[PDB]
Amino acid sequence: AYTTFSATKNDQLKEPMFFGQPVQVARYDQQKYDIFEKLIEKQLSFFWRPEEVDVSRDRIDYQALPEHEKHIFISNLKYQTLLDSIQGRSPNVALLPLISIPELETWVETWAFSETIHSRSYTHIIRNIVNDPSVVFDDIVTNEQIQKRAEGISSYYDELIEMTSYWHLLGEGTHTVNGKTVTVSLRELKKKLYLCLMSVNALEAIRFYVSFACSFAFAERELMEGNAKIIRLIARDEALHLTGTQHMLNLLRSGADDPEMAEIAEECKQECYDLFVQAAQQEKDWADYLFRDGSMIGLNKDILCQYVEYITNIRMQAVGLDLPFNTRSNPIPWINTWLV
Amino acid sequence: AYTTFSATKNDQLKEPMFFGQPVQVARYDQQKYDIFEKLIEKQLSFFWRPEEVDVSRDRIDYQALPEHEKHIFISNLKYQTLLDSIQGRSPNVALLPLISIPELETWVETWAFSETIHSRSYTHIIRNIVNDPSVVFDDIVTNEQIQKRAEGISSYYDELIEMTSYWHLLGEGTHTVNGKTVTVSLRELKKKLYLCLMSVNALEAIRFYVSFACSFAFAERELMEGNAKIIRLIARDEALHLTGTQHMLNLLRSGADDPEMAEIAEECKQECYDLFVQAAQQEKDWADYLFRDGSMIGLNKDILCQYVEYITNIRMQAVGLDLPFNTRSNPIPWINTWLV
Ligand SMILES: [Hg+2]
Ligand SMILES: [Hg+2]
Ligand SMILES: [Hg+2]
Ligand SMILES: [Hg+2]
Ligand SMILES: [Hg+2]
Ligand SMILES: [Hg+2]
Ligand SMILES: [Hg+2]
Ligand SMILES: [Hg+2]
Ligand SMILES: [Hg+2]
Ligand SMILES: [Hg+2]
Ligand SMILES: [Hg+2]
Ligand SMILES: [Hg+2]
Ligand SMILES: [Hg+2]
Ligand SMILES: [Mn+2]
Ligand SMILES: [Mn+2]
Ligand SMILES: [Mn+2]
Ligand SMILES: [Mn+2]
Known part of the structure; x- marks a missing residue:
């Protein structure tokens, strides 16, 4: 099943991205796909620290905001914080036990790390504009409407993680677990990962x-x-x-x-x-x-x-x-001035 | 029973570090133990990239070393590479499904990310001193002498990962899996984590x-x-x-x-x-x-x-x-010129 250092000398250039042998040596001299290497480099160039951005005037601007647009600002912020909370932990918990090439393994750990920086920037903003952070943060979990547009994200990752543990423990086959029949199929696990990826794509590309x-x-x-x-x-x-x-x-x-x-x-x-x-x-x-x-x-x-x-x-x-x-x-071409 | 966003509003200041409810909101405004927030902040301010240290003259120096000394240099580097190959991935795959407080969850992801930068620096060094990298990298996996601990270190992590998958899937008690009896005990899982934490402490504290x-x-x-x-x-x-x-x-x-x-x-x-x-x-x-x-x-x-x-x-x-x-x-006081 899963091992943190697999003991077979293998050609990491001939492994698939996912479901092959677990990566054991992390080397960066050679890559099967260099785009993941390019991305790690680019992401590291972009290292930034939220604390160093001055947001003091936003307490005054926020204060001056009409209640209805104060509500737009904060509801938007609460959803961004929900999504980066899940994106901080999930690439590492769901994808990282299934990777077989080193450049994708490190890109995934670099990708989940930059999400925790995004979470830190949200703490930085909330703590400056609002007088008690906890009414914002406790509301994220409990707001029926924020969970309603989030429907499906945690489910995809959770089903994937569960299926992966059954495959790691039991291997492919039809098994008897506490008197119930459970079938583990790698083909089914592969489409579970593929649809998970397709959902991650929707999350980062549209929802954000x-x-x-x-x-x-x-x-x-x-x-x-x-x-x-x-x-x-x-x-x-x-x-x-x-x-x-x-x-x-x-x-x-x-x-x-x-x-x-x-x-x-x-x-x-x-x-x-x-x-x-x-x-x-x-x-x-x-x-x-x-x-x-x-x-x-x-x-x-x-x-x-x-x-x-x-x-x-x-x-x-x-x-x-x-x-x-x-x-x-594009209905809002002004967003071009601000983007990506 | 793992979830990437638990739906229960919970006071995560009263949560245990491990085997409590999965963290759902990532907040950094309050924390149960201030030290992990302090470790995240220090680590972020220590960020460096290997590429701007030039290791160019190290090629001449290595080529000029007496053979036995280049065996010591390279064999020491090879071990440094194995230990950070394991440490890039393993905090994330073994600890992250068990944490119940946010500042420890993001310290484990920041901790693991700084290891991959260490794995990137060993490629930067090897590329420059030994113009055929694959000789060095393919020997870490098979080297008999590096191997005994490789196996011991990965074993703690692999049994904890395995016992954790059983615990989240089946929960406690006596279960039957294809004719076999399998007993899951939280007490044992707690020992396993503890011995593993103790072994990661030995690795960073002594082995490095x-x-x-x-x-x-x-x-x-x-x-x-x-x-x-x-x-x-x-x-x-x-x-x-x-x-x-x-x-x-x-x-x-x-x-x-x-x-x-x-x-x-x-x-x-x-x-x-x-x-x-x-x-x-x-x-x-x-x-x-x-x-x-x-x-x-x-x-x-x-x-x-x-x-x-x-x-x-x-x-x-x-x-x-x-x-x-x-x-x-201390037998070798001179070393303090290089350590913190
Ligand atoms: Hg909008
Ligand atoms: Hg995914
Ligand atoms: Hg997903
Ligand atoms: Hg498709
Ligand atoms: Hg519409
Ligand atoms: Hg040495
Ligand atoms: Hg040594
Ligand atoms: Hg030594
Ligand atoms: Hg002990
Ligand atoms: Hg361990
Ligand atoms: Hg450990
Ligand atoms: Hg110990
Ligand atoms: Hg002890
Ligand atoms: Mn993000
Ligand atoms: Mn993202
Ligand atoms: Mn290290
Ligand atoms: Mn370390």
Whole structure:
């Protein structure tokens, strides 16, 4: 099953990305896929520290905000904090026991690490603008609506982690565990990982980009500029994370890695279409809560719905799926000045 | 029973470090133990990249070394590579599914990330001094002499990972798995974690510190100066990682955190004492492979075995175990010019 140092001298250049022999020597002189090496380098160039960004004027700007847009700001912030809390721990708990090449193993640990920095920046902002952080942080867990647009994220990772432990302990086969039949199939585990990856792709490429647009609406009005400095940095890292899953998924589709992953990508092309349409509709539903006690001059549900469509079509194309929505030009081209 | 976002609103200030509820919100505004937040902050400010230390002249110096001394240099480096290959991945795969407080969860991910940068620095050194890297890297896996501890270190981690998968899947009790009986006990899992934590403490506290003495003896002779600049920054990092395991162990045995961990630490006293003398012995034995073809100026088998004894006594002292070796002063004071 899993070992932290596998004892077989193997050619790490001939392993698949996932499900081969566990990585044991971590070397960076040679890589099967150099894009993961490029990404580690680029991410390390971008090392930034949240504490050094001045957000003192955002306490005054936030204070001056009307209650309805104070509600938009904080609800957006609470969802960003939910997503990076899961992205901090989950690439490491779910993907890291299944990797077989070194450059992907380290990219995954570098990717989960930059998410904990994003979590730290959210503590930095909340602690400056609000007088007791705990009403924000305890509300994340319990808000029916924040969990409602998050529906499916923790489930995908949790099902993957469970299936992986059954495969590590028991191996492929049909087994009797406490008098129940349990079938472990590597093919099924492979599509569980593939759909997990496709969901991670939706999360980083769409869900964060909708939240970024809600954030920079305020900076366009010249409000909350400290928070906009941080989100600009967060966004520059999400660019890399997104590029990462786009290539993981496209090399798996190419059939140049594990040939059975090419096969799975085709067989579930419909599930991959259906999870992006689900995630698009979830981001749209949230608008009913975001503009609940009032909308904003440049930002309302029609602008949010038109941007979700816009961004979902771009992302789906980048990974070879059919576009669900009618083509449109970018409803909010001002976000270009702020981006990634 | 692992989840990447538990839905229960819980006071994570009252949670135990391990085997409580999985962390769901990542917050850094309050913490149960301030030391892990302090270790994250120090580690972030220590960030360095290997690429800007030039190891160029180290090629001439290595080529000019007497054969036996280049055997010592390279065999020491090979061991440093094995131990950080294991340490990049293993905090994350073995500890992360068991943590119940956020500041410890993000210290384990920051801890593990700084190890991969150490693995990147060993590739930077080897690439430059031994223009065919695969000779060095393929020999770490198979080398008989490096191997005995490789196996011992990975064994603690692998049995904890395995017992943890059984615990999350089946929970406690007596279960049947394909005709066999399998008994899962949280008490045993707690011992397993404790012995593993004790072994990671020996690795960073003793095993790395014996290899530092071998790297700085060359720098004392003004040879391998690029390598020396890099081990200086690695060593600075290791001091923090060692502070961490010391505090987690001392808080666990005090009974301050979980009262059952205090009991387990008491029952395990003689086998923790034995794991440490075994670590020191395996370090002492490596010296006969190292002084295979002869010895060096400033370091030899006897002075080196004295240092192992000295350093083991200090580290066992700090974690409140009885000292195994007869007390002495530091055999090689010069080393303090390079350590923190
Ligand atoms: Hg995933
Ligand atoms: Hg997922
Ligand atoms: Hg928005
Ligand atoms: Hg697909
Ligand atoms: Hg819409
Ligand atoms: Hg261990
Ligand atoms: Hg451990
Ligand atoms: Hg040594
Ligand atoms: Hg040496
Ligand atoms: Hg030594
Ligand atoms: Hg013990
Ligand atoms: Hg002990
Ligand atoms: Hg021990
Ligand atoms: Mn993020
Ligand atoms: Mn991300
Ligand atoms: Mn290290
Ligand atoms: Mn370390």
